[PDB]
Design a protein around this ligand. Structure first.
Ligand SMILES: [Ag+]
Length: 300
């Protein structure tokens, strides 16, 4: 399997690339692309780690050599304005060079950029709804951390379902579904708010000087590695991502996905919702739909 990271020179890209270099299956390939001219040496830096993952890096305006042969494309470039055009340009190159790959959109605003990517793929005539993913995994590992801390559980043992979108009120952690624990009314309210604003914690703690890069690299790595396990034939691999699903709530929606050799193998039910969660779901959907329309309109 060959994984291409676009935007590999930024904070998220370098963290992601480091984890993939050390954790992808032996015999994989990792290609790094970023407009920053340092990118070939980010790959050379990583190439000195003795794992059986061949890694090369590319800069300039042409992402094609990084995308040659790619099976998975993870897109972390950017910093709406500028990121809309970057995602559009880069998905255009993906559609021309490796249209059969699975595409993981990390570039935010994920709610909207996944829609941009969809429309660019549709105009290219190669759009496969089962191969376009909004990487929401950072919401899940955050929820796992906060619930484990509150409830005195081991962090690696707690898994919190999170559905919906990837920003603010559209992020819906399903605390009612966490096995073995229950939450008071205040704890639901506090936990949900913290999860929906967790990125702001880092910004304030960085004194406004940066954003979440290292935890985001870890979350993208978790998704990217599960996806590759599935594309190599492992079964029972379930991960949540923002995908063009059936559309019962919105055109794109994050829900549990059984992954397979062709991307999404099955969109799984979001399951039973508490009255709090059903109400938060209904309250955010207009915002989520307008995030989606913004991305559709950028391209069309
Ligand atoms: Ag694929």
């Amino acid at each position: 399997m060959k994984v291409a990271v676009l935007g590999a020179a930024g904070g998220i890209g370098q963290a992601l690339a480091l984890l993939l270099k050390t954790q992808l299956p032996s015999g994989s390939e990792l290609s790094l692309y970023d407009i920053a001219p340092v990118t070939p040496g980010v790959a050379v830096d990583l190439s000195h780690i003795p794992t059986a993952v061949k890694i090369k890096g590319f800069s300039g305006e042409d992402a094609t050599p990084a995308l040659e042969g790619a099976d998975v494309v993870l897109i972390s470039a950017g910093v709406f304005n500028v990121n809309a055009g970057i995602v559009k340009n880069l998905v255009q190159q993906v559609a021309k060079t490796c249209p059969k790959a699975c595409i993981g959109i990390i570039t935010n605003p994920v709610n909207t950029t996944v829609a941009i990517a969809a429309e660019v793929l549709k105009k290219a005539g190669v759009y496969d709804k089962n191969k376009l993913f909004g990487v929401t995994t950072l919401d899940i590992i955050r929820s796992n951390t906060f619930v484990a801390e509150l409830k005195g559980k081991q962090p690696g043992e707690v898994e919190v379902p999170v559905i919906g979108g990837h920003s603010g009120v559209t992020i819906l952690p399903l605390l009612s579904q966490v096995p073995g624990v229950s939450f008071t009314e205040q704890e639901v309210a506090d936990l949900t708010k913290r999860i929906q604003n967790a990125g702001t914690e880092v910004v304030e703690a960085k004194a406004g000087g940066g954003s979440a890069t290292l935890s985001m690299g870890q979350a993208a790595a978790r998704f990217g590695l599960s996806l590759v396990r599935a594309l190599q034939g492992e079964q029972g691999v379930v991960e949540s991502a923002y995908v063009e699903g059936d559309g019962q709530y919105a055109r794109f929606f994050s829900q549990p996905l059984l992954l397979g050799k062709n991307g999404v193998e099955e969109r799984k039910s979001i399951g039973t919702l508490s009255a709090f969660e059903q109400n938060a779901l209904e309250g955010m959907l207009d915002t989520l739909k307008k995030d989606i329309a913004l991305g559709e309109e950028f391209v069309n």
